[PDB]
Design a protein around this motif. Structure first.
Motif, PDB file in Angstrom:
ATOM      1  N   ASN A  46       0.815  -1.215   0.000  1.00  0.00           N
ATOM      2  CA  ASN A  46       0.000   0.000   0.000  1.00  0.00           C
ATOM      3  C   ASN A  46       0.851   1.269   0.000  1.00  0.00           C
ATOM      4  OD1 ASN A  46      -2.453  -1.471   0.021  1.00  0.00           O
ATOM      5  ND2 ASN A  46      -2.457  -1.553   2.266  1.00  0.00           N
ATOM      6  N   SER A  47       1.930   1.269   0.777  1.00  0.00           N
ATOM      7  CA  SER A  47       2.895   2.371   0.767  1.00  0.00           C
ATOM      8  C   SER A  47       3.530   2.534  -0.616  1.00  0.00           C
ATOM      9  CB  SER A  47       4.000   2.123   1.798  1.00  0.00           C
ATOM     10  OG  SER A  47       3.463   1.858   3.081  1.00  0.00           O
ATOM     11  N   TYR A  48       3.901   1.410  -1.228  1.00  0.00           N
ATOM     12  CA  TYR A  48       4.443   1.410  -2.585  1.00  0.00           C
ATOM     13  C   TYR A  48       3.432   1.965  -3.591  1.00  0.00           C
ATOM     14  CZ  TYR A  48       6.135  -0.276  -7.097  1.00  0.00           C
ATOM     15  OH  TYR A  48       6.551  -0.348  -8.403  1.00  0.00           O
ATOM     16  N   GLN A  49       2.195   1.475  -3.518  1.00  0.00           N
ATOM     17  CA  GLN A  49       1.131   1.944  -4.405  1.00  0.00           C
ATOM     18  C   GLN A  49       0.775   3.401  -4.164  1.00  0.00           C
ATOM     19  OE1 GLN A  49      -0.158   0.503  -7.041  1.00  0.00           O
ATOM     20  NE2 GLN A  49       1.028  -1.391  -6.757  1.00  0.00           N
ATOM     21  N   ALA A  50       0.862   3.844  -2.915  1.00  0.00           N
ATOM     22  CA  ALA A  50       0.591   5.244  -2.584  1.00  0.00           C
ATOM     23  C   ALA A  50       1.532   6.149  -3.360  1.00  0.00           C
ATOM     24  CB  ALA A  50       0.744   5.488  -1.090  1.00  0.00           C
ATOM     25  N   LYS A  51       2.817   5.807  -3.323  1.00  0.00           N
ATOM     26  CA  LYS A  51       3.842   6.561  -4.022  1.00  0.00           C
ATOM     27  C   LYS A  51       3.681   6.424  -5.518  1.00  0.00           C
ATOM     28  CE  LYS A  51       7.114   7.508  -0.524  1.00  0.00           C
ATOM     29  NZ  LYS A  51       8.538   7.670  -0.103  1.00  0.00           N
ATOM     30  N   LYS A  52       3.220   5.261  -5.964  1.00  0.00           N
ATOM     31  CA  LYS A  52       2.969   5.054  -7.377  1.00  0.00           C
ATOM     32  C   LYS A  52       1.811   5.921  -7.871  1.00  0.00           C
ATOM     33  CE  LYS A  52       2.328   1.725 -11.055  1.00  0.00           C
ATOM     34  NZ  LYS A  52       0.972   2.190 -11.475  1.00  0.00           N
ATOM     35  N   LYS A  53       0.729   5.975  -7.099  1.00  0.00           N
ATOM     36  CA  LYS A  53      -0.407   6.833  -7.429  1.00  0.00           C
ATOM     37  C   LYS A  53       0.032   8.296  -7.496  1.00  0.00           C
ATOM     38  CE  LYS A  53      -5.034   8.131  -5.960  1.00  0.00           C
ATOM     39  NZ  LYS A  53      -5.769   8.454  -4.708  1.00  0.00           N
ATOM     40  N   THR A  54       0.835   8.702  -6.512  1.00  0.00           N
ATOM     41  CA  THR A  54       1.415  10.046  -6.484  1.00  0.00           C
ATOM     42  C   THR A  54       2.320  10.289  -7.697  1.00  0.00           C
ATOM     43  OG1 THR A  54       1.219  10.562  -4.119  1.00  0.00           O
ATOM     44  CG2 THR A  54       3.113  11.515  -5.262  1.00  0.00           C
ATOM     45  N   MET A  55       3.122   9.301  -8.064  1.00  0.00           N
ATOM     46  CA  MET A  55       3.992   9.451  -9.224  1.00  0.00           C
ATOM     47  C   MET A  55       3.207   9.416 -10.533  1.00  0.00           C
ATOM     48  SD  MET A  55       7.543   7.511  -9.851  1.00  0.00           S
ATOM     49  CE  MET A  55       7.796   7.678  -8.088  1.00  0.00           C
ATOM     50  N   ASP A  56       2.176   8.580 -10.575  1.00  0.00           N
ATOM     51  CA  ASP A  56       1.314   8.473 -11.739  1.00  0.00           C
ATOM     52  C   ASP A  56       0.685   9.821 -12.080  1.00  0.00           C
ATOM     53  OD1 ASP A  56       1.889   5.782 -12.084  1.00  0.00           O
ATOM     54  OD2 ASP A  56      -0.223   5.152 -11.932  1.00  0.00           O
ATOM     55  N   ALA A  57       0.200  10.515 -11.055  1.00  0.00           N
ATOM     56  CA  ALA A  57      -0.464  11.796 -11.238  1.00  0.00           C
ATOM     57  C   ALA A  57       0.488  12.914 -11.668  1.00  0.00           C
ATOM     58  CB  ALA A  57      -1.191  12.191  -9.960  1.00  0.00           C
ATOM     59  N   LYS A  58       1.790  12.735 -11.435  1.00  0.00           N
ATOM     60  CA  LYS A  58       2.776  13.796 -11.693  1.00  0.00           C
ATOM     61  C   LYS A  58       3.579  13.633 -12.998  1.00  0.00           C
ATOM     62  CE  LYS A  58       7.494  14.001  -9.729  1.00  0.00           C
ATOM     63  NZ  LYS A  58       8.007  12.602  -9.680  1.00  0.00           N
ATOM     64  N   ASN A  59       3.757  12.399 -13.474  1.00  0.00           N
ATOM     65  CA  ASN A  59       4.648  12.135 -14.617  1.00  0.00           C
ATOM     66  C   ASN A  59       3.976  11.934 -15.986  1.00  0.00           C
ATOM     67  OD1 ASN A  59       7.001  12.487 -13.147  1.00  0.00           O
ATOM     68  ND2 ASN A  59       7.347  10.287 -12.804  1.00  0.00           N
ATOM     69  N   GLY A  60       2.713  12.339 -16.104  1.00  0.00           N
ATOM     70  CA  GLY A  60       2.036  12.360 -17.393  1.00  0.00           C
ATOM     71  C   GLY A  60       1.949  10.995 -18.051  1.00  0.00           C
ATOM     72  N   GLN A  61       2.370  10.934 -19.315  1.00  0.00           N
ATOM     73  CA  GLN A  61       2.409   9.684 -20.086  1.00  0.00           C
ATOM     74  C   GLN A  61       3.448   8.657 -19.618  1.00  0.00           C
ATOM     75  OE1 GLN A  61       3.921  12.474 -20.946  1.00  0.00           O
ATOM     76  NE2 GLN A  61       5.467  12.229 -22.568  1.00  0.00           N
ATOM     77  N   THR A  62       4.347   9.031 -18.713  1.00  0.00           N
ATOM     78  CA  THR A  62       5.460   8.147 -18.393  1.00  0.00           C
ATOM     79  C   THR A  62       4.936   6.864 -17.772  1.00  0.00           C
ATOM     80  OG1 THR A  62       6.771  10.123 -17.870  1.00  0.00           O
ATOM     81  CG2 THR A  62       7.762   7.969 -17.335  1.00  0.00           C
ATOM     82  N   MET A  63       5.496   5.735 -18.200  1.00  0.00           N
ATOM     83  CA  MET A  63       5.256   4.459 -17.537  1.00  0.00           C
ATOM     84  C   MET A  63       6.269   4.390 -16.405  1.00  0.00           C
ATOM     85  SD  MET A  63       2.713   3.452 -19.230  1.00  0.00           S
ATOM     86  CE  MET A  63       2.514   2.009 -18.181  1.00  0.00           C
ATOM     87  N   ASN A  64       5.808   4.721 -15.209  1.00  0.00           N
ATOM     88  CA  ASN A  64       6.689   4.912 -14.061  1.00  0.00           C
ATOM     89  C   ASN A  64       7.271   3.648 -13.462  1.00  0.00           C
ATOM     90  OD1 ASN A  64       6.440   7.861 -13.779  1.00  0.00           O
ATOM     91  ND2 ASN A  64       4.289   7.387 -13.344  1.00  0.00           N
ATOM     92  N   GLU A  65       6.712   2.487 -13.797  1.00  0.00           N
ATOM     93  CA  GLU A  65       7.136   1.239 -13.168  1.00  0.00           C
ATOM     94  C   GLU A  65       7.836   0.309 -14.139  1.00  0.00           C
ATOM     95  OE1 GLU A  65       4.434  -2.338 -11.662  1.00  0.00           O
ATOM     96  OE2 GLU A  65       4.720  -0.886 -10.051  1.00  0.00           O
TER      97      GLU A  65
END
Ligand SMILES: c1ccc(C(OC2CCN(CCCCNc3ccc4nncn4n3)CC2)c2ccccc2)cc1
Length: 173
Positions: A46-65
């Motif tokens: 959940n902590s990992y996904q929290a940061k992923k959701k936060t990163m998802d919202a900030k990096n546009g089209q980027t596939m962050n993972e």
């Protein structure tokens, strides 16, 4: 906060096993896989996904993972299952990097250990050898660094909960 976990040995006939085994064997087919387990740590996830959701919202089209490999010694396996990878932590694009005895140190029985990890590489840049955190892109920083930006072979992550050790591969020569 506890971050207790379960360790589940995958069936070789399981598509999930085959998926993980197959990526490993793109470069490590000459090793012998003894078993593959999935690490189930609800809190850490959940902590990992929290940061992923936060990163998802900030990096546009980027596939962050990305799913990268990490070699470690036998003794660290319990620590990593609980705390993940909390001068950052290094992850390999190809498993043969991580399979090196320097990272996946063979234990007294000959077993070597490599995690197949979900990593928020996010937006990265070329990395020099003197970073405690990523440099600035203002004061907003990169998510990881890499040996080469166009053709990467390793990444370095610097923050808590930026990696999840989803699968462990126990194997030998
Ligand atoms: C000049 C410049 C930089 C330095 C040092 O900075 C980095 C160099 C070594 N790095 C370790 C790389 C190991 C590979 N890590 C894995 C480990 C598992 C694994 N599994 N798959 C892939 N890997 N990679 C990190 C730190 C330094 C060190 C200590 C104190 C100060 C400075 C020294 C002099």
């Amino acid at each position: 906060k506890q971050q207790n976990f379960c360790v589940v040995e995958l069936l070789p006939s399981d598509p999930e096993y085959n998926t993980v085994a197959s990526k490993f064997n793109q470069t490590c087919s000459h090793f012998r896989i003894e078993k593959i387990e999935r690490i189930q740590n609800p809190d850490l996830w959940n902590s990992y996904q929290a940061k992923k959701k936060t990163m998802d919202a900030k990096n546009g089209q980027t596939m962050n993972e990305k799913q990268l490999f990490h070699g470690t010694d036998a003794g660290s396996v319990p620590h990593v299952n609980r705390n993940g990878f909390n001068k950052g932590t290094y992850f390999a694009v190809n498993a043969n990097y991580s399979a090196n005895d320097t990272y996946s140190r063979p234990d007294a029985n000959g077993r070597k250990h490599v995690y197949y990890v979900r990593v928020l590489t996010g937006i990265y840049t070329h990395g020099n050898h003197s970073l405690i955190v990523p440099p600035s892109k203002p004061t907003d920083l990169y998510d990881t660094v890499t040996d080469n930006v166009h053709h990467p072979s390793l990444f370095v992550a610097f923050y808590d909960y930026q990696a999840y050790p989803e699968y462990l591969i126990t194997f030998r020569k």
